[PDB]
Amino acid sequence: VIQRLQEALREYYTLVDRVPALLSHLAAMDLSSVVSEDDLVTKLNAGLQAVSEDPRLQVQVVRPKEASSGPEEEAEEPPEAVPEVPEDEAVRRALVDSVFQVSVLPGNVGYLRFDSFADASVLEVLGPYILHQVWEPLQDTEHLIMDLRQNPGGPSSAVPLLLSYFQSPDASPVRLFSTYDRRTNITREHFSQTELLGRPYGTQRGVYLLTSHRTATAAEELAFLMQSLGWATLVGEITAGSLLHTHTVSLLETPEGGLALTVPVLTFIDNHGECWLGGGVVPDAIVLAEEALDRAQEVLEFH
């Protein structure tokens, strides 16, 4: 295991600057006490966390009782696909009308719910119809509640575009985050768009994002970015901690019973320079998911 792990880390771990020290320490550990996968995992996990403080980097073994399947993920989300988008304008409007639920709550508070993030190629096709369903009806409102408590996310490709409806229309765009993918040399700065289709909500009106423990992937990134940019108040539960920033590497060591290592290959550096380690968005106002809408209304009322 140790040999495969050091190789996997050197080539794929997001924080390349920690590799020299890891290569020094890992081979120097006392391994004459461990003789089971579970022990090897636990021992290396304790040492890796002491050296890295990165919870995304974790050795995990299968259920020891059924070693063909383990705690290595489930499966990538299935949202609306670009090859399945209707051609007819009436059908496209109708589909947008069921994807996005928009209400004007008493006191002129906008409510927006949607429960997936589609790829930006899909949002491109739906954009003209989203103007009618979302962006125009909420223009009258002075505050907006975005409900993501039922949103398990999807691709993050349209997250910069969506965020830009809550930003200044002008140029230059605002820096959202920077990606550093170790597997290559990404260092790609991600910016807002200078032009959106339909009316932006703007940067001034109050925005409140509702979260649950089921909130996942792109929805967590959208919530985190609305928080990191100080654009909205996050309300609800700590989110699922499922971001698409890691890859799973099996240990071909069958004596070690079905082990694998999940390695962050991507570092997400926000606009304040903070590295986000995922594990869940932490709300500004932590409440159970059922209480989040009430709490957002309270915050609005007593502003």
């Epitope: 399945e84 209707p86 007819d88 304008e89 059908v91 409007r93 109708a94 009308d97 069921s98």
Partner: antibody
């Protein structure tokens, strides 16, 4: 050719459950969605829900809680489960195909099944 | 809410033009509601006539047309025939659900 046939229990008791099957033929469920519609005696039509090709479902909000739709791609079957029956759930239950691959995008219920009569009584 | 209403009964005679309307409780009917018109024939024979406001299904007679008349969807029968005597249902799409109207009972004299 495109056909939809419903089959259900006929008689069901108040406060119990209802399960109906829509068997389709002439088209694949992996490519087409299916809607469930009901017609209470001497009433108009009422939409219950749809299950799209990709598996997403949408429900009439009024029913939302008591209804559940599912399918079997390989089997060419769509199912509707309805709970907490009251005698006002007495109706002709229909399945209809969902279609949108037109010249201009629009959703349409293009082919309708023949219906199945459900009597909710004690 | 999202209550669709239609006239409940209309009567015509062969060769005349009749217009059936469909109204949304929520506001003006738009293209995005994809008005569908379904025909009910004795002993629950349902046939889709028009989809997406104005698209006549291929097997339907050319005398059936659909349009947006102001704030409502309309089904016009130009030169009504005795076999047009049926119940006509209107359905409107509201982004995540369909809502059917009450139906119009059309009587054709002669």
């Amino acid at each position: 050719q495109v056909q939809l046939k419903e089959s259900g229990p006929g008689l069901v008791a108040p406060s119990q459950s209802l399960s109906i099957t829509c068997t389709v033929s002439g088209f694949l469920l992996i490519s087409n969605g299916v809607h469930w519609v009901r017609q209470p005696p001497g009433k108009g039509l009422e939409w219950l829900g749809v299950i799209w090709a990709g598996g997403n479902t949408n429900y009439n909000s009024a029913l939302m809680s008591r209804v559940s739709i599912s399918k079997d791609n390989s089997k060419s079957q769509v199912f509707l489960k309805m709970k907490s029956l009251q005698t006002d759930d007495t109706a002709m239950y229909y399945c209809a195909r969902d279609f949108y691959d037109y010249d201009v995008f629009y959703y349409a219920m293009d082919y309708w099944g023949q219906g199945t009569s459900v009597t909710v009584s004690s | 809410q999202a209550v669709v209403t239609q006239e409940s009964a209309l009567t015509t005679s062969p060769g005349e033009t009749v217009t059936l309307t469909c109204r949304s409780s929520t506001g003006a009917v738009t293209t995005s509601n994809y008005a569908n018109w379904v025909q009910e024939k004795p002993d629950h024979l349902f046939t889709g006539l028009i989809g997406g406001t104005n698209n006549r299904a291929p097997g339907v007679p050319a005398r059936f047309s659909g349009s947006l008349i102001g704030d409502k969807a309309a089904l016009t029968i130009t030169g009504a025939q005795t076999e047009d005597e049926a119940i006509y249902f209107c359905a409107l799409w509201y982004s995540n659900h369909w809502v059917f109207g009450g139906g119009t009972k059309l009587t054709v004299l002669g």
